[PDB]
Structures are given as C-alpha cells and as structure tokens.
Amino acid sequence: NENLFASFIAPTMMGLPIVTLIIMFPSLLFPTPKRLINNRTISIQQWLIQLTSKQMMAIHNQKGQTWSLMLMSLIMFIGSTNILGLLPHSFTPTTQLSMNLGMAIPLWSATVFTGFRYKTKTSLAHFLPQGTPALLIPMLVIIETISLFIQPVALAVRLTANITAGHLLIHLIGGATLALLNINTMTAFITFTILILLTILEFAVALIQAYVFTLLVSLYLHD
Amino acid sequence: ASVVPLKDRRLLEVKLGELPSWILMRDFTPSGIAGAFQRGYYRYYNKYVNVKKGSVAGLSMVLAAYVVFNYCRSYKELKHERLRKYH
C-alpha cells in the first residue's frame, strides 16, 4: 500500500465550435511560390511531395494516372488536420464522424462508377476469381459482395475511431498528473509516459498512408 | 476590410517567414536568404537554432497564435477559479 493512484471524474467534451474557420486554417500554412528558386521553407514542402508522388504513381501506370494528382491533395489535408490538434487547446475536424462519411462515400463510389462507364461487364465480373469449382458458387458471391459494401464504412470508421482514441489518453493520463497531490515520486513517471505517448501520436501521419493507399488499392483493383 | 486582412498576411509572410523568387522579386528573394529569422529568434531563449532552412520561428508563431485563440473559447467552461488567485 505504497503508491495509491488517483482519478478525477470529469466529462470529456468533443464540443462543436465554429468549424468553417478551423477547416480553412491548415490551407494557409502552405504557401505557393511563383519563382524559380524558392525560399527554403517552401522548398522542404516541395521536396516532401515529390517523394510520395512517386509511390502513388508507380503502381497504377495506366491512363488512370490522371486521378493521382488529386490523391496527393487528400494526403496533405488529413496529414495536416491530424497534426495540428496535438497542440494544447486546438480542435481537429477529423474528430467528428460527420465529414469522414463525406470523405469516404464521394470517393469510394467514384471508383465503382469508373469501370462501369468503360468496361461495363468485367469490373464486377472481378467477382469471378478463378476456374470455377462446383460446391462453392453461392458461398462465394454472398461473401465477396458483403465485403464490398463494408468498404465505405471500413474506410471512414477506421479513421475517426483511433484519432479520438489518441485524444482521450492525452487527457486521462494527463489529468491524473493534476490530481496527484499524493506521493510526488510517481508524478514524473506519468509525465514520462505522456512524452512517450505524444511521440506515438505522431502516428497521425502514419494513418494517412493507410487512407490514401487503400483508396489506391480500391482504385487499382477496380481499374 | 478585405484589403486590410489580406495585407496582414502578406506582411507576416514576406518579412517574418516568406519572400519567394520570381524576379521583380529576385533581390527580394535573397532578402529572405539572410532572413528576418535573426529578428524572430530572441523570443524563446536561444534554443530553436535550426531555423536556417527549415524555419521554426516562421511557422511556430502561427501555431502559438492558434493556441491562445482557442484558449478563449474554452475559458467559459473550465472556470475552476475560487474567490482568490492561484500560487
């Protein structure tokens, strides 16, 4: 009975203040120069794109490369709006589940209607995998279609659910420091747990690779 | 008032953190090559010294402004203050 942890009971509030300012604000962090040589703070933004434009280009190699100049705009928005919110009292728009159901469905259904305007038969004859055995036709095409319509829900809900899960352990491990007016040795160890956990919460960049990329595979496979 | 707020960012870019190229701005581009980062430096203590070509004081002022702007909205909810001052 040496080190008694404490807790504080307080509501954890994802309120909704004025959003249409907060969305526009990580656009003005990135400038664009009309010059040949630039000014050594855009120049490391301009290099960072020319890496990861050479990995969502290499797989496709089609005349579906026209689509890929948009997919690098999709990575900078939720790459920024997940990285701004680590600050003391900032607010992330990708916390709320509303816009992510408007980021999945106008993009996911832009893929199944891409081959249906050109191929019209073999896009969803990709439901036929192989040299058909007899015992498992109805066990297959009720499975590979129930794992198609999961994909818009599978794409949005994986983003909202772990981003907000980062924010609660920021509060709760952090709030247990404030309410630790018992023995002062254990206060540092909870603080040292925080400054490790904030390094893990720069996997909010790592979770945007797993949103543009499984949009490519959900584009490359259909087209 | 639109030309008033637009001439705020074009002053806090070309001096604090920006002054790109495209001649008619060529010597204005090298004006940021020395940079006003030496002017921006003295606020922290000394330690963010890496601002030479990845410029911290150019960026870390906006993000320090966006924190204290969002401290105002939260102030009404988390009151907590007694009939006194803190330590």
């Binding site: 009309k34 280009m57 | 190229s21 495209w22």
Partner: peptide, 24 residues
C-alpha cells in the same frame, strides 16, 4: 540571368506541354 531569375524565362528551353504528356 540570375540564379533566382524567373519561372517563365526558364520555361523556354525546358519544355511544357498540354494535359497528360509527362508520363513519369
């Protein structure tokens, strides 16, 4: 001209084209 000269005067020798020319 200068090193930091222009984004259109360097657009004479090195080329630009119409939509979907540069494959890589």
């Amino acid at each position: 001209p200068f090193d930091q000269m222009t984004i259109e005067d360097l657009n004479e020798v090195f080329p630009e084209t119409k939509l979907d020319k540069k494959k890589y």
